[PDB]
Design a protein around this ligand. Structure first.
Ligand SMILES: CC(=O)N[C@H]1[C@H](O[C@H]2[C@@H](O)[C@@H](CO)O[C@@H](O[C@H]3[C@H](O[C@@H]4O[C@@H](C)[C@@H](O)[C@@H](O)[C@@H]4O)[C@@H](O)[C@H](O)O[C@@H]3CO)[C@@H]2O)O[C@H](CO)[C@@H](O[C@@H]2O[C@H](CO)[C@H](O)[C@H](O)[C@H]2O)[C@@H]1O
Ligand SMILES: CC(=O)N[C@H]1[C@H](O[C@H]2[C@@H](O)[C@@H](CO)O[C@@H](O[C@H]3[C@H](O[C@@H]4O[C@@H](C)[C@@H](O)[C@@H](O)[C@@H]4O)[C@@H](O)[C@H](O)O[C@@H]3CO)[C@@H]2O)O[C@H](CO)[C@@H](O[C@@H]2O[C@H](CO)[C@H](O)[C@H](O)[C@H]2O)[C@@H]1O
Ligand SMILES: CC(=O)N[C@H]1[C@H](O[C@H]2[C@@H](O)[C@@H](CO)O[C@@H](O[C@H]3[C@H](O[C@@H]4O[C@@H](C)[C@@H](O)[C@@H](O)[C@@H]4O)[C@@H](O)[C@H](O)O[C@@H]3CO)[C@@H]2O)O[C@H](CO)[C@@H](O)[C@@H]1O
Ligand SMILES: C[C@@H]1O[C@@H](O[C@@H]2[C@@H](O)[C@H](O)O[C@H](CO)[C@H]2O[C@@H]2O[C@H](CO)[C@H](O)[C@H](O)[C@H]2O)[C@@H](O)[C@H](O)[C@@H]1O
Ligand SMILES: [Ca+2]
Ligand SMILES: [Ca+2]
Ligand SMILES: [Ca+2]
Ligand SMILES: [Ca+2]
Ligand SMILES: [Ca+2]
Ligand SMILES: [Ca+2]
Ligand SMILES: [Ca+2]
Ligand SMILES: [Ca+2]
Lengths: 114, 114, 114, 114
């Protein structure tokens, strides 16, 4: 199935934060309405934050996360979970290698903000 | 129900990260096997990452998150989600006020690392 | 925090299924737009299905699950999970006793159908 | 990523329930320790419960869901959710066609029971 694609409410600010757990430099691209809105880059094996930003979901609300490492797209796993009918998490894990730990870049999207 | 309590695998490193979305200064306490292991604080209405840390779950794997604002416990919501039977997120929201956005402090725990 | 309340897309059919795991007879009510839409009751300690129905979320999309045992409201815990940005689960557990298993009535809502 | 594979606690009873939403007849197989322990088949476009069963995770705890339509495997999506650190849902959707609704067979596993 497609992974890393989420429909947010329109015109809504959301947070996006990425963590790295890999020897490879992770490049995380966040696309809003099909256009690149943020790009994070970094390397850690200790869950460092490699980027955080606040974005607006725009007219459609479409948000897509993509991850690549040494020019190759990582395999993604994702889900959205909603707590108390209010608090939304869009979660992505990614795998750049052969161990299927799926933590190589971890991306958390959360809304609402404020 | 009790919220903000998670059983992790024993002797496992995990990340804990907190975000703020409130006019009130948030204080986030992270307990591991019933003793404080990390404390984060800050004040933002734009999702600032007020703290992030790597901890070890220790022998019994018990991790608890508590949130307070001006000495008053916040009401918590939480859940754990597991992707591809590998990648774990323990999620907490909290409410310090009257609007029930539950984002006033948001805490994300992730494992495994590395 | 409020539990067992979910906002569905309007005019959408959804399934609701309830299971029992308790010595007490479980009464499960499903409200749509603040009005009773379905009621199930039964008793099992081995996960029997005590009710299943297809409902329409109607003009409001507002769905609430309530659980009680002989006039005593059970404590609920709930969350919504979305897979591949398409497949939705609204999940409820409930506790009628002292063991905090939260399985005494379990309610699963899923959409879309068809 | 692998989907539909879950690690349960050993020697633990769990419920498994399957729903259908497709013109095609769904075949759902639930494997415990790599052998089929339950099978359900049926056709519905209205979320029929094509089967429910209580199984034991046995000595290994590995549980796998497979879905096919006249022998053709369906693509799966899955996740596990844990509420109040005690109530577990393992969730599966599947796609047999071209519309990406992922509801063609839906499988929910819950534990603990009793
Ligand atoms: C009927 C039965 O199962 N008897 C068991 C006894 O079971 C208890 C135990 O399950 C407790 C857990 O809190 O709950 C008692 O029931 C209370 C109700 O709880 C609900 O139903 C339960 C069955 C659980 O599903 C629970 O999660 C639910 O919340 C509650 O709603 C109600 O208001 O009050 C009830 C109590 O009045 C339930 O009776 O457990 C004992 C100890 O395990 C069993 O005794 C043991 O039996 C084994 C054989 O299996 C053996 O004989 C052993 O020596 C003996 O101690 C008893 O059979
Ligand atoms: C039988 C039926 O429902 N006929 C409908 C027609 O429905 C389509 C549509 O649902 C597509 C979606 O991809 O799938 C067709 O079935 C395919 C199988 O898909 C599975 O079953 C489906 C019912 C869905 O659940 C889907 O999610 C499943 O994956 C697939 O497994 C198989 O390999 O191939 C199948 C054929 O492609 C299904 O037939 O939809 C049309 C258009 O909406 C309906 O026609 C409209 O009917 C209304 C009245 O309701 C009115 O008459 C209107 O004018 C007319 O266009 C048709 O009745
Ligand atoms: C003074 C100001 O900025 N006014 C804008 C107003 O802001 C409100 C509104 O957000 C309400 C929502 O309940 O909360 C008030 O703040 C609370 C505070 O709530 C916390 O902080 C908020 C910013 C928000 O994040 C809440 O979710 C959070 O719980 C409480 O903690 C505190 O005890 O009491 C204060 C005061 O009541 C905000 O001041 O929002 C509107 C709507 O956008 C704007 O028009 C105002 O300019
Ligand atoms: C540290 C390690 O990084 C990543 O794996 C890399 C991979 O991206 C790259 O292409 O190739 C190397 C060498 O094989 C990988 O590193 C090894 O990964 C092993 C596990 O598969 C093991 O961790 C070795 O210690 C590494 O040298 C990640 O995909 C991996 O999860 C892990 O974080
Ligand atoms: Ca990896
Ligand atoms: Ca890794
Ligand atoms: Ca608030
Ligand atoms: Ca807030
Ligand atoms: Ca109970
Ligand atoms: Ca019970
Ligand atoms: Ca389909
Ligand atoms: Ca379908």
């Amino acid at each position: 199935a497609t992974q890393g694609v989420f429909t947010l409410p329109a015109n809504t600010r959301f947070g996006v934060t990425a963590f790295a757990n890999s020897s490879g430099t992770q490049t995380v691209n966040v696309l809003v309405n099909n256009e690149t809105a943020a790009t994070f880059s970094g390397q850690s094996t200790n869950n460092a934050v490699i980027g955080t930003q606040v974005l607006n979901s725009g007219s459609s609300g479409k948000v897509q996360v993509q991850v690549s490492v040494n020019g190759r797209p990582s395999d993604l796993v994702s889900a959205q979970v909603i707590l108390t009918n209010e608090l939304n998490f869009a979660l992505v894990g990614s795998e750049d290698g052969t161990d299927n730990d799926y933590n190589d870049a971890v991306v958390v999207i959360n809304w609402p903000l404020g």
